[PDB]
C-alpha cells in the first residue's frame, strides 16, 4: 500500500467557472418551469448563491435576455421564473465586483433510527425541528447544553423567491450571539487556551470571537478569496468532501487529492466544481496516497514549482490533511501491517507534509504567508474499543504545540487543531441514542461549517499568535464512561431488532399452522415484472389548434410544400447500437429496460424462442450461449456489466478486426546467421509465377547423374517472412463486440461477399425505413415514379477492408475473393442498397467529403430534390476503421496518442474530450448513419413521420485544394449579408407583407 | 474546436444574435468518437432526437473548457443534460480535410403544419397514426426473428 | 550540435543539406504545411528532449547553439534509428553497420566521433536504391567521407591456405 | 564456426539456452531490484538497514 | 512496375542440418514479438556479444516475383513532367501523381476560358460563389499503395500520405493553389460515370443559386494495385490473347 | 535523535517511532496472545511505559514527542479493549 500513485502529468485542473455559471443558471429554468423545484425548496436559494458567487457582466446579460424573454402567460411556472429571475438579475448586479462568499443553506438534519415492529432496523436523517436555519444552529451551539452548564425569522422553507433578495443584503447583527453564552456554561463549539500549568481550559472570550464569526459567517457568509489550500482525503460523502464544497464557494484555490483515481472519481469532482466553485476558485485533483513518503516529497514540489517547470506556481495558505483509512476490530494483539500503515497515512506523513512545505516556504524566503494547518483530532483516545492504532495516531498530534513554540518553523506553519466530533456518515444507528444525553451530533455538512469557520479571517490571526485548539465536540467528553454507554445503546438496538425479527416470523408461522398456507397463499399477492416494449419514437402530433398557434398565422398557404425538404426517417450503427440506444447513453447516461434489451439483442446476448424448450412452452428472450430462459427484468442485472464493458470507446478488441493487434503491428525484416556451408535449392510447387528474381547464378550439371531437380543458388537474395513491432494508438470506438448482421436478416452469402462497411450500411437503411413507417421500400412506388427515388449517400475512404485486400493483401499470396475491387468503391456501397432494397432509377450521386461527407450528402441530397430530380432521397454517410487507416492517422499525429493518455491517467471511456483544455486529438470510430429525406407535400400525402425541416445545408471551401489538414473560415459565408444601409426596414423579412403579395 | 467555436461566434456576432443569448454546444463525439465519414450523420441523427425531445445532451467528458474559448461569448459548453421546454432549431456544422466545411440547420417539424389547412392536417394525422402502428408491428416481427 | 541539427533538418525535408541554410528559420523552411513543422520539431524533441517552448521562429543557427552545448556526442534515439534504417535498407547483404564502422577506422582511420559524423553525413545523401556489392558500399562510404571531412576541415604466405584447402 | 552449428543441429544441443536462461534471469533481477530500491526510496536506507 | 515481373510472397531452398539463428544490434525495437520463448540461454557472461538465439519454425522476410498478362495501358506521353507547366518541385514531391495531373488541367481549362488568373472571377462574383464539383474514381491510388501496401514494407513513406489518398483532397490543391473558393464543396465518386455525375451535381449546384461558377470534371490514375484487380475481374482485355 | 526538526523528520525518525511506539504496542500486543492461549488470566503483566513531560516543549528532538505522547492513549484502551486481564498499564515519567 506504500506504492507510489502520483504523477505530475496526472493532475487535473478545473477552472472554467465562467462557463458553469451560465450552465447552472440555465439549469434552474428547466427545473422551475418543469416544476422539479418549487418556490419552497431549499435548493433554489442554495443554488442562487452559487450563481451569484460566479457573477460577471456576461452572465448578467445571459439571464437578462433569458428572463426578459420568458413569456409568463404560458403558465404559472413561467411566472415563477419571471419573478424569481428578476431578483437574481438585480441581485447579481450588486454582488458583482464583490468577493464570493459561501452561505450554507441546507436544512440541518438530525439522526433518526427507527426499527420496524417487523424487527427491521433503518437509519434516517430527518430535518431537525428546533433548528431550520444555520443561525438557529449556531445559537443552540452557543447556549451549550444542560450537561454543558457547569430570531430573524425568514422565508427559508416558506418562500425561496423572497429570500433571494435577502442574500446580497448584509443583514448585520446587533445583539452578538456570543452574549447568549450563559455563565458557567460551555457552548458546544468552543476554542481552548493553554494555561501556564500546561493543560487546555475553556476560555470564554477567545471562544467568543470564534463563535460569533461563525454566526456572522452564517448570515453574510465568509469569503476565502485568495486562499490557497491543500486538502487531502475527500472521498464522496466524507468528512472533508463538504469542506471542499465550502472552500470552493469562497473562491479558494484548492488542491484535493484522492487515493482511488479513476473516471467516476473525477466526474464526481467535475460535478463539484461545476456546481460550487466560484469566481477565481480553482481545484486540482491529483492522485495521491498519504502513506508514500516519496509521494509527499513530490506533491508539494508540484505545488511549489513554476508553471514553466510543469509545476503549479502556487503557495499554500492552509493545509487540511484529513486522509485516513478505516480499521476496526483491531485490538492490541491484532495491531499489525494495516495499522502500521495507517499510522503513516495519519501521523508520520502529516508530519512530513508540514515538514516539507517549510523547505519550500524557506527556500523562496516566504516568511509572511504562513500555512495554517488544520489537524483533524478527536477526543477518542483509546476510549472507544478496538480502532487499531487510530488513537496514538491522532493523540500524537497535539504534540504539535510543544513544537510551534520550540522549533523554527513557526513563521511558515501555524497549527490550528480541530476535532472530529460525532459526524454522521464517515456506527450511524446510535446517534439518535446519544443525542438524548444533551449531546449534539453533527451532519457532515454541519461539521463542515465548523471546521470551515476555522478559517475565518478573525481566527486566522488568532492562530497566528498562538496555536489554537478548537473543540468542535458536542460535549462528548462529559458523558462519562461513554464506551459501554455507547456499547449498550447498540446492544439494545439489536435485541429490540432481533426479538421482533424472531417473534414476528413465528407468529406469522403460527398463523400458518392454525389456518394453513392453503388459504394463506391467496394473500401472497401476484406481483408483475415489466416487460421490454421497445418504441419507434415517432414525433407526437399535438392537435391542430396548438400548432396553428406556434407558427405565424400568415404562414398557411404561403409555402410551396413541394419545395420544403423534410427528414422522414433515420437510423444508425455506432459504437452504441442503433439511434435509439445511443440517445440513451447520450441524453440519459444509462440504459433503460428497452435499451438494455435491445443492446442485449444486437450484441447477441439474448435470442428469441417460442415453442417448447424443457418441454414447457417458452416464449420470450433466452440466453444465446446457454439457451436458458431469461426474463427482461433480469437482463439488466445479468448483462449490463458486459454490454457496457464492450460498447463505446474501448481498448481495441482484435477479433473485430481479424487479428489486428495494435501491440503487434506487422512489418518486414530479416533474421540471424550460421556457420558457412550453403548453396540453396527449391521444391516442385510454385515454380510457375515465381521464377524471375535471381539471375544466372547456378553451378549447373546438365548430365543426368543426379536425379531430382531444383534451382541451385547462393547468398545474395532478399526473402520471405514478414515481422512485427509495437504501436501506440490503441483504442477506437468499435461497434459493440458481437454485432452480427445475421441478427438483422442479412444473408450469409452477402456477408461473405460484401465488405464490412457495406454490411453496416444495409442495416442502417432498413432501420431508417423502419423508422419512417416505410416497412417495405416498394410502397414508395405507390406514390412516386421509380425514377424519383434517389440516393445521395457517401463515405470517407469506404471499403478500406477491400483496399486492404488488393493494395496490401493480394501480393501476400493469400486467397482474396476476385470480386474484391468492386467493394473498395464508395459508389458500390450505396449500390447494394439499390441492389438489395430499392430498385431506384437514375444517375445517383455519391459525395466523398473526407469528414464532412455527411453534411455534403444532405447538401446534394436537398438540391437534388428541389431541383425536381427526385421526390425521395437517401442521404447519409458511413465509414470503417482498420489499421491501414489508423496508422496513417497516427503518423499524421491527428488521433490522440494512447500511451500518453495512460500517463495522464486518462481512461478509455474519456479519451475523447471535445472543447477541453487538455484535448489531445480525436478518436476514430466506425459505423454508418443515414436518413430518408423527402419533399414536404409528398410526406403529407404519404403519411410519414416528419422529424425535421432541413431549412439549409451548404458546404463551403476557401479555394483550390491546397492544404488539407487545417480548417478555416469556409462556412462563415453562410452568413454573408450586407449591412451597408440598415436604417430603413426590409419589407421582405415580414410575412404580413409577403402574404399580401402572394 | 478552437476554430469551430470561433466561426460560430461571428455568424451569430454578424447576424445580430441577441447579446447574452448563446447557442448551446452539443459535442456528440465524446461518446462515439469520430466516424471519419459518418460524423455529420450521427450529429444530424442526434440533432433530430433533440428537436422532438427538447433534451440537450451534455459533454459528460468536459473537465474544463479551455480559457481561450471564453472570448466566444455566443456559445455555451454544457456538461450535464438539459431538459428544455423545446428547441426550435439546431445547426449541424462539420469540418474535414480538404477544406470541405458544411453547416446544415434543422427547424422544428411543428413549424411546418402551420402552413397547411386544418382538414388536411388532421387528415395527415390519422394517416401517420396508422403507419406508426404498422411500423411497430413490422419492427417487432423482424427484431424477433 | 550544428552537424546533427542540420543533418536532421534535411532528412525530414527530403532535400540535401546545402539546400537548407542554417541562418533561415524552420517557419519559413516548412513552406506552410504546418504538419511537417510539428513533426520536425517532434523529431528533434526526442533527439534532444531539451527545447525552448516556441522554437518555430528561432533560426537554424540560433536553435543549434542551444542544442550544441547541452548535447555531448550522444547520437540520440531518433538519430540512432534513422542511421540504422539507412544501413539496413540501403547496403548490400552482410554489410552491416559494424562492418561499415570498422572499414571507416581501417581504410580511412576515423574514431567513433569522426566515424559517427561520416555515417551521420551519409544520411543526408542517401542512395535512392540498395547498393549492390561491397565495392559500392565502400565507395559510397568513402565518397561521403570526403564530404564529412570537408564539412569539418580534417583532411587525411599462401601454402598456409593451399593445404588448408586441400583437406576440405 | 560453421561445422560447429550444423553439428549442433544433430545432437539437438541448443547453444543458446546458456543465454536465454541468463537473459530471463537478468530482467527478473532488474525488476526485482526495481522493487528493492523502491523501498529504500520510501522507507529510507536507515530504516531498511 | 514491370508487368512481366509482378512481385509477391514466397520462400526458398534448403541446406545440411546445423543451424540455430541469431540477430544483430539495429532494429530490435519495433521488431521483437514474433517467436516466443525458444532460446538456449546462458545468462552468465562467459560469451561477450548478445543476440537472440533461435531455431527452425519461423516465416520470414523476402518478397518474390511472378508473371502477369494485362500488359498495355494508355500512358500519358512518356516524359511528361509537370515541371514543364510551372508546377513547383516541392509539390510534385509532396503530392500524389493524380493531383499533379489535375492542376495542369485546371490551369489550361482557365487558359482555355479567357480566365488567365483565377481571381478575375472575383471581379464579377462573390468569393463564395465559385464552386467545385470535381471527383475521381478511386483517386490517389498511388498513396493507398503507400499506406495500405507500402508502409508495412518498411520503406520511407512521407507521413502526410493519407491526406493524398482522398478524392476530396485532390480538388483541394486546386483551391489551395489556384482559386481560394469559399463553401461546402461537393465531390462525386461514380466509379466510371463520375465525370457526368460531376456535371450533374455541378449544374444543379449552379441553378440552385449556390454558385455562379463551378469546376466540374473527373480524373484517375493507373497502377498495378488497380489493373491487377481489374485483371481478375476479367474486365480489361487480356493482352496475351490479343 | 537530535537536531531533527519538522523538515528533517525522515528515515531515522520513522525508524525511532517503531522502536518506541508501534513495537511497544506489539510487545503488549503479543504477550496477550501468549497469556490468552495458556489461559493465564490471573497473572497480569504490569507494563511500565517510560513517558515524559516533553511533548514538543523542547526543541528538535525529532519524532520523539508524538512517540511518547501517543502512549497515554494506553488508558483509553485498558478500559475499552479486551486485554485488561493480562496487561495492566503503569505509566511512568522520564523526569530529568
Ligand atoms: N468522522 C469523525 O468522526 C472523525 C473524528 C475525528 C477525526 N476525523 C477525521 O476525519 C477526517 C476526514 O475524513 P473522515 O475521516 O471524516 O472520513 P473518511 O471517510 O475517513 O475519509 C477517508 C479518506 O481517506 C482517503 N484515503 C484513504 N486512504 C488513503 C491513503 N492511503 N492515502 C491517501 N488518502 C487516503 C480517502 O480518499 P478517497 O476516498 O478519495 O480515497 C478517503 O475518502 C479523517 O482525516 C479523520 O482523521 C473524523
Breaks (C-N over 2.5 A) in chain C follow: 156
Q: C–F contact (≥3 CB pairs within 8 Å)? A: no
Burial class (CB in 10 A: 0-12, 13-18, 19+), A895: buried
Please state at what angle helix A76-91 crosses helix A42-53, rounded to 10 degrees.
Answer: 40
* CA–CA–CA angle A299, A393, A460 (5° rounding): 60
H or E stretch at C102: helix C97-106
Probe site for chain C from E88, E156, E163, E164 (most C CB atoms < 10 A): E156
H or E stretch at C138: helix C134-152
* CA–CA–CA angle F6, F7, F10 (5° rounding): 90
A694 C-alpha to ligand 1 centroid (Å): 75
Q: How far apart are CA A754 and CA A800, in angstroms?
A: 12
According to DSSP, the residues that pair with A847 across neighbouring strands are E188
Active site residue E133: no
Between the alpha carbon of residue A953 and those of residues B103, B106, E199, F21, the distances in Å are 6, 9, 20, 76
Q: What is chain F's alpha carbon radius of gyration, rounded to the nearest angstrom?
A: 15
Q: How far apart are CA E157 and CA F36, in angstroms?
A: 78
| F10 CA: distance to closest CA in chain D (Å) | 8
Check if A324 has its Cβ closer than 6 Å to any atom of ligand 1: yes
* B101: nearest CB among A555, A885, A970: A970
Q: Is A878 in a helix, a strand, or coil?
A: strand
* Closest alpha carbon to A791 in A728, A854, A723, A864: A864
Chain F residues inside the 8 Å CB shell of D40 = none
Nearest CA in chain D to E37: D20
Chain A: list its partners (3+ Cβ pairs within 8 Å).
B, C, D, E, F
Chain F residues inside the 8 Å CB shell of A380 = 76
Q: Is the Cα torsion angle C14, C16, C19, C23 positive or negative in sign?
A: positive
| Helix ranges, chain E (H) | 89-94, 97-111, 121-124, 141-144, 161-164, 172-174, 194-208, 224-232
How many Å from the N-terminal Cα to the C-terminal Cα in chain C? 54
A268 C-alpha to ligand 1 centroid (Å): 17
- Tell me how far the alpha carbon of residue A158 is from its chain's centroid: 34
Mutate to test the pocket of ligand 1, among A261, A322, A395 (most ligand atoms within 8 A of CB): A322
Q: How many CB pairs under 8 A join A and E?
A: 341
Q: How far apart are CA A793 and CA A857, in angstroms?
A: 6
Q: How far apart are CA A376 and CA A193, in angstroms?
A: 18
Q: How far apart are CA B96 and CA E94, in angstroms?
A: 20
Breaks (C-N over 2.5 A) in chain A follow: 150, 426
Residue pointed to by grid coordinates 593445404? C163
Annotation-wise, does C72 bind a ligand? no
According to DSSP, the residues that pair with A413 across neighbouring strands are A371
Method: cryo-EM
Task: Say yes or no for a CB contact (<8 Å) between C97 and E25.
Answer: yes
Q: How far apart are CA E128 and CA A157, in angstroms?
A: 60
Check if A793 has its Cβ closer than 6 Å to any atom of ligand 1: no
Q: Is A414 in a helix, a strand, or coil?
A: strand
**For ligand 1, atom 11, which residue shows the shortest CA distance?**
A322
Query: Cβ(E103)–Cβ(E215) under 8 Å?
Result: no
Residue pointed to by grid coordinates 495512460? A902
* Closest alpha carbon to A770 in A534, A595, A598, A570: A570
Mutate to test the pocket of ligand 1, among A323, A341, A444 (most ligand atoms within 8 A of CB): A323
H or E stretch at A856: helix A853-867
Q: How far apart are CA A578 and CA A581, in angstroms?
A: 5
Residue pointed to by grid coordinates 468569393? E127
- Tell me how far the alpha carbon of residue B129 is from its chain's centroid: 25
Beta strand segments in A310-360, E = 318-321
**For ligand 1, atom 48, which residue shows the shortest CA distance?**
A420
Q: How far apart are CA A423 and CA A63, in angstroms?
A: 39
* D8: nearest CB among E18, E37, E39: E18
Query: Cβ(A511)–Cβ(A126) under 8 Å?
Result: no
Residue pointed to by grid coordinates 530482467? D27
Check if A426 has its Cβ closer than 6 Å to any atom of ligand 1: yes
DSSP state of A836: I
Q: Is A258 in a helix, a strand, or coil?
A: strand
| Helix ranges, A69-170 (H) | 76-91, 135-142, 160-164
Active-site option among E60, E62, E191, E192: E192
Query: Cβ(C25)–Cβ(C5) under 8 Å?
Result: no
Residue A299 has phi, psi (to 5 degrees) of -80, -40
Between the alpha carbon of residue A14 and those of residues A283, A286, B37, the distances in Å are 6, 11, 33
Probe site for chain C from E23, E24, E26, E150 (most C CB atoms < 10 A): E26
Nearest CA in chain A to B99: A957
Check if A420 has its Cβ closer than 6 Å to any atom of ligand 1: yes
Residue pointed to by grid coordinates 442495416? A763
Q: How far apart are CA E64 and CA A690, in angstroms?
A: 7
Beta strand segments in F2-79, E = 45-47
Residue A821 has phi, psi (to 5 degrees) of -70, -25
Half-sphere exposure of A683 (CA within 13 A, CB side): 8
The reported resolution of this PDB entry, expressed in Å, is: 2.8
Q: How far apart are CA C55 and CA A902, in angstroms?
A: 27
* Closest alpha carbon to A946 in A666, A505, A567, A513: A567
| A297 CA: distance to closest CA in chain D (Å) | 10
Burial class (CB in 10 A: 0-12, 13-18, 19+), B103: buried
Amino acid at each position: 500500500g506504500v506504492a507510489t500513485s502520483f504523477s505530475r502529468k496526472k493532475a487535473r485542473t478545473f477552472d472554467s467557472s465562467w462557463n458553469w455559471a451560465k450552465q447552472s443558471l440555465l439549469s434552474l429554468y428547466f427545473e422551475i418551469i418543469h416544476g422539479v423545484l418549487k418556490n419552497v425548496d431549499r435548493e433554489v436559494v442554495s443554488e442562487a448563491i452559487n450563481i451569484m458567487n460566479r457573477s460577471n457582466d456576461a452572465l448578467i446579460k445571459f439571464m437578462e435576455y433569458h428572463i426578459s424573454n420568458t413569456d409568463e402567460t404560458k403558465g404559472e411556472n413561467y411566472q415563477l421564473v419571471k419573478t424569481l429571475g428578476e431578483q437574481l438579475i438585480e441581485n447579481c448586479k450588486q454582488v458583482l465586483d464583490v468577493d464570493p462568499v459561501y452561505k450554507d443553506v441546507a436544512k440541518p438534519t438530525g439522526p433518526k433510527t427507527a426499527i420496524d415492529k417487523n424487527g427491521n432496523i433503518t437509519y434516517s436523517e430527518e430535518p431537525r425541528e428546533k433548528v431550520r436555519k444555520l443561525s438557529q444552529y449556531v445559537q443552540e451551539m452557543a447556549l451549550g447544553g444542560p450537561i454543558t452548564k457547569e430570531d430573524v425569522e425568514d422565508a427559508l422553507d416558506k418562500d425561496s423567491t423572497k429570500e433571494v433578495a435577502s442574500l446580497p443584503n448584509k443583514s448585520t447583527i446587533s445583539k452578538t450571539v456570543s452574549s447568549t453564552i450563559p455563565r458557567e456554561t460551555i457552548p458546544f463549539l468552543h476554542l481552548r487556551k493553554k494555561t501556564p500549568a500546561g493543560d487546555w481550559k475553556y476560555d470564554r472570550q477567545l471562544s467568543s470571537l470564534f463563535l460569533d464569526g461563525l454566526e456572522k459567517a452564517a448570515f453574510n457568509g465568509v469569503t476565502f478569496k485568495d486562499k490557497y489550500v491543500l486538502i487531502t482525503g475527500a472521498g464522496k460523502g466524507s468528512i472533508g468532501a463538504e469542506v471542499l464544497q465550502g472552500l470552493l464557494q469562497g473562491g479558494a484555490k484548492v488542491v484535493v487529492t484522492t487515493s482511488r483515481f479513476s473516471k467516476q472519481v473525477t466526474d464526481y469532482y467535475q460535478s463539484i466544481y461545476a456546481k460550487y466553485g466560484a469566481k477565481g476558485s480553482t481545484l486540482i485533483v491529483v492522485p495521491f496516497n498519504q502513506g508514500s513518503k516519496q509521494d509527499v516529497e513530490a506533491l508539494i514540489e508540484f505545488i511549489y514549482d513554476t508553471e514553466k517547470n510543469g509545476g503549479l506556481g502556487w503557495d499554500l495558505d492552509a493545509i487540511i490533511p484529513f486522509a485516513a483509512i478505516p480499521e476496526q476490530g483491531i485490538e492490541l494483539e491484532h495491531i499489525d501491517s494495516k495499522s502500521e500503515f495507517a499510522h503513516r497515512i495519519m501521523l508520520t506523513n502529516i508530519l512530513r507534509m508540514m515538514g516539507c512545505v517549510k523547505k519550500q516556504k524557506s527556500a523562496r524566503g516566504i516568511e509572511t504567508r504562513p500555512a495554517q494547518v488544520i489537524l483533524p483530532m478527536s477526543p477518542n483516545h483509546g476510549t472507544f474499543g478496538g480502532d487499531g492504532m487510530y488513537s496514538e495516531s491522532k493523540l500524537s498530534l497535539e504534540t504539535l504545540f510543544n513544537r510551534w513554540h520550540s522549533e523554527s518553523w513557526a513563521n511558515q506553519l501555524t497549527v490550528c487543531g480541530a476535532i472530529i466530533g460525532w459526524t454522521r456518515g464517515t456506527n450511524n444507528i446510535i446517534a439518535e441514542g446519544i443525542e438524548k444525553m444533551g449531546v449534539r451530533t453533527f451532519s457532515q455538512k454541519e461539521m463542515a461549517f465548523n471546521l470551515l469557520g476555522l478559517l475565518t479571517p478573525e481566527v486566522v490571526e488568532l492562530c497566528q499568535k498562538s496555536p489554537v485548539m478548537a473543540d468542535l465536540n458536542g460535549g462528548l467528553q462529559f458523558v462519562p464512561e461513554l464506551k459501554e454507554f455507547t456499547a449498550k445503546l447498540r446492544k439494545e438496538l439489536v435485541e429490540t431488532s432481533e426479538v421482533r425479527k424472531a417473534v414476528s416470523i413465528e407468529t406469522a408461522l403460527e398463523h400458518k399452522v392454525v389456518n394453513g398456507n392453503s388459504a394463506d397463499a391467496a394473500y401472497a399477492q401476484v406481483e408483475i415484472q415489466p416487460r421490454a416494449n421497445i418504441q419507434l419514437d415517432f414525433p407526437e402530433l399535438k392537435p391542430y389548434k396548438q400548432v396553428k398557434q406556434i407558427a405565424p398565422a400568415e404562414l398557411e398557404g404561403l409555402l410551396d410544400l413541394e419545395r420544403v425538404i423534410v427528414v422522414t426517417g433515420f437510423a444508425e450503427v455506432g459504437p452504441w447500437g442503433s439511434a435509439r440506444t445511443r440517445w440513451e447513453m447520450e441524453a440519459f447516461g444509462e440504459f433503460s429496460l428497452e435499451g438494455c434489451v435491445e443492446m442485449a439483442w444486437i450484441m447477441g446476448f439474448i435470442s428469441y424462442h417460442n415453442g417448447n424448450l424443457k418441454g414447457r412452452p417458452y416464449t420470450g428472450w433466452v440466453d444465446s450461449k446457454t439457451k436458458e430462459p431469461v426474463d427482461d427484468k433480469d437482463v439488466k442485472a445479468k448483462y449490463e456489466t458486459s454490454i457496457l464493458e464492450h460498447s463505446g470507446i474501448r481498448l481495441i478488441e482484435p477479433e473485430l478486426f481479424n487479428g489486428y493487434n495494435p501491440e503487434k503491428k506487422e512489418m518486414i525484416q530479416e533474421v540471424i546467421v550460421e556457420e558457412d556451408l550453403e548453396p540453396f535449392e527449391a521444391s516442385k510447387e510454385t515454380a510457375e509465377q515465381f521464377k524471375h528474381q535471381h539471375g544466372d547464378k547456378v553451378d549447373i550439371f546438365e548430365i543426368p547423374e543426379t536425379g531430382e531437380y531444383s534451382v541451385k543458388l547462393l547468398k545474395g537474395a532478399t526473402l520471405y517472412i514478414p515481422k512485427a513491432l509495437r504501436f501506440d494508438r490503441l483504442v477506437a470506438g468499435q461497434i459493440p463486440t458481437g454485432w452480427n448482421a445475421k441478427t438483422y436478416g442479412i444473408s450469409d452469402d452477402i456477408i461473405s461477399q460484401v465488405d464490412p462497411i457495406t454490411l453496416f450500411v444495409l442495416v442502417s437503411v432498413v432501420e431508417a425505413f423502419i423508422a419512417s413507417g416505410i416497412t417495405d421500400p416498394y410502397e414508395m412506388y405507390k406514390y412516386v415514379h421509380v425514377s424519383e427515388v434517389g440516393n445521395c449517400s457517401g463515405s470517407g475512404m469506404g471499403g478500406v477492408s477491400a483496399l486492404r485486400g488488393m493494395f496490401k493483401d493480394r501480393f501476400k499470396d493469400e486467397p482474396v475473393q476476385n470480386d474484391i475491387l468492386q467493394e473498395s468503391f464508395i459508389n458500390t456501397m450505396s449500390a447494394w442498397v439499390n441492389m438489395l432494397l430499392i430498385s431506384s432509377s437514375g444517375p445517383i450521386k455519391t459525395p466523398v467529403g473526407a469528414c464532412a461527407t455527411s453534411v455534403e450528402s444532405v447538401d446534394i441530397g436537398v438540391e437534388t430534390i428541389l431541383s425536381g430530380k427526385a421526390r425521395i432521397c437517401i442521404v447519409g454517410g458511413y465509414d470503417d476503421f482498420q489499421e491501414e487507416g489508423s496508422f496513417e492517422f497516427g503518423n499524421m499525429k491527428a488521433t490522440s496518442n494512447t500511451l500518453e493518455e495512460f500517463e495522464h491517467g486518462r481512461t478509455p471511456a474519456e479519451m475523447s474530450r471535445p472543447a477541453t483544455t487538455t484535448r489531445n486529438g480525436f478518436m476514430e470510430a466506425q459505423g454508418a448513419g443515414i436518413q430518408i429525406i423527402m419533399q414536404a407535400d409528398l410526406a403529407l400525402k404519404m403519411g410519414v413521420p416528419i422529424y425535421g425541416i432541413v431549412a439549409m445545408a451548404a458546404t463551403a471551401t476557401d479555394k483550390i485544394g491546397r492544404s488539407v489538414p487545417a480548417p478555416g473560415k469556409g462556412i462563415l459565408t453562410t452568413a454573408r449579408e450586407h449591412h451597408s444601409s440598415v436604417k430603413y426596414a426590409s419589407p421582405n423579412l415580414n410575412m404580413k407583407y409577403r402574404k399580401r403579395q402572394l | 474546436d478552437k476554430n469551430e467555436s470561433a466561426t460560430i461566434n461571428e455568424m451569430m456576432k454578424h447576424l445580430g444574435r441577441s447579446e447574452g443569448n448563446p447557442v448551446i454546444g452539443v459535442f456528440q463525439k465524446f461518446l462515439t468518437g469520430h466516424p471519419k465519414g459518418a460524423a455529420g450523420a450521427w450529429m444530424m441523427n442526434g440533432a433530430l432526437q433533440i428537436l422532438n425531445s427538447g433534451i440537450i445532451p451534455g459533454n459528460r467528458n468536459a473537465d474544463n473548457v479551455d480559457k481561450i474559448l471564453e472570448q466566444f461569448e455566443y456559445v455555451l459548453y454544457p456538461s450535464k443534460t438539459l431538459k428544455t421546454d423545446g428547441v426550435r432549431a439546431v445547426s449541424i456544422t462539420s469540418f474535414g480535410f480538404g477544406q470541405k466545411g458544411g453547416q446544415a440547420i434543422v427547424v422544428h417539424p411543428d413549424y411546418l403544419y402551420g402552413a397547411i389547412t386544418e382538414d388536411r392536417y388532421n387528415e395527415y394525422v390519422a394517416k401517420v397514426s396508422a403507419r406508426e402502428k404498422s411500423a411497430y408491428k413490422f419492427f417487432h416481427n423482424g427484431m424477433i426473428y | 550540435a550544428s552537424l546533427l541539427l542540420h543533418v536532421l533538418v534535411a532528412h525530414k525535408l527530403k532535400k540535401s543539406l546545402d539546400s537548407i541554410p542554417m541562418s533561415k528559420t524552420i517557419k519559413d523552411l516548412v513552406g506552410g504545411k504546418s504538419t511537417v513543422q510539428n513533426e520536425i520539431l517532434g523529431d528533434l524533441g526526442k533527439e534532444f528532449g531539451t527545447t525552448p517552448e516556441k522554437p518555430e521562429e528561432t533560426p537554424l543557427e540560433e536553435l543549434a547553439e542551444t542544442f550544441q552545448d547541452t548535447f555531448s556526442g550522444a547520437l540520440g534515439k531518433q538519430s540512432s534509428s534513422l542511421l540504422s534504417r539507412l544501413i539496413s535498407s540501403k547496403m548490400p547483404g552482410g554489410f552491416t553497420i559494424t562492418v561499415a564502422r570498422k572499414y571507416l577506422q581501417t581504410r580511412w582511420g576515423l574514431p567513433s566521433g569522426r566515424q559517427d559524423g561520416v555515417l551521420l553525413v551519409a544520411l543526408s545523401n542517401e542512395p535512392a536504391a540498395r547498393l549492390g556489392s561491397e565495392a559500392d558500399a565502400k565507395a559510397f562510404l568513402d565518397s561521403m567521407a570526403q564530404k564529412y571531412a570537408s564539412i569539418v576541415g580534417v583532411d587525411l604466405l599462401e601454402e598456409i591456405t593451399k593445404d588448408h584447402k586441400v583437406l576440405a | 564456426r560453421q561445422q560447429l552449428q550444423v553439428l549442433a543441429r544433430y545432437l539437438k544441443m541448443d547453444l543458446d539456452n546458456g543465454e536465454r536462461k541468463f537473459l530471463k534471469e537478468k530482467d527478473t533481477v532488474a525488476e526485482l531490484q526495481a522493487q528493492l530500491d523502491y523501498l529504500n526510496a520510501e522507507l529510507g536506507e536507515f530504516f531498511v538497514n
